[PDB]
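Hi D.,

Good news: the full-assembly prediction came through. Inputs first.
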Amino acid sequence: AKLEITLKRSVIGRPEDQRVTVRTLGLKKTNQTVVHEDNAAIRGMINKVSHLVSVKEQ
RNA sequence: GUCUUGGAGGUAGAGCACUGAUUGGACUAGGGGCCCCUACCGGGUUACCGAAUUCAGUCAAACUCCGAAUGCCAAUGACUU
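Then the structure:
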């Protein structure tokens, strides 16, 4: 399942468990839209980052 | 990194399984009181303290029969980087 991921809130000030999981999705600017296919791995990457990332169904 | 799975460790919490500390009641070994007599063996009075033991109930960084949340060490399946 294709799945948009955007940054509604930046990376400054969050701890660096909440940066690498942001980084390993390729996110490197706010409101950058990197679309990976949905998977139980990647659904577990948005659990740790939920106050920061909006998912989107495709 | 993220999910699954495997773990080590005795923390925060709790509870008393021990090391301690402790409230109150039954239980009363011992003691004291008071007399009798003790010239001595001893006995009776306790709304007098009281060891054990027991019914509950409290609290511990140097208390754990118990034990989380994460966190670390890796595997092999990937999905990014």
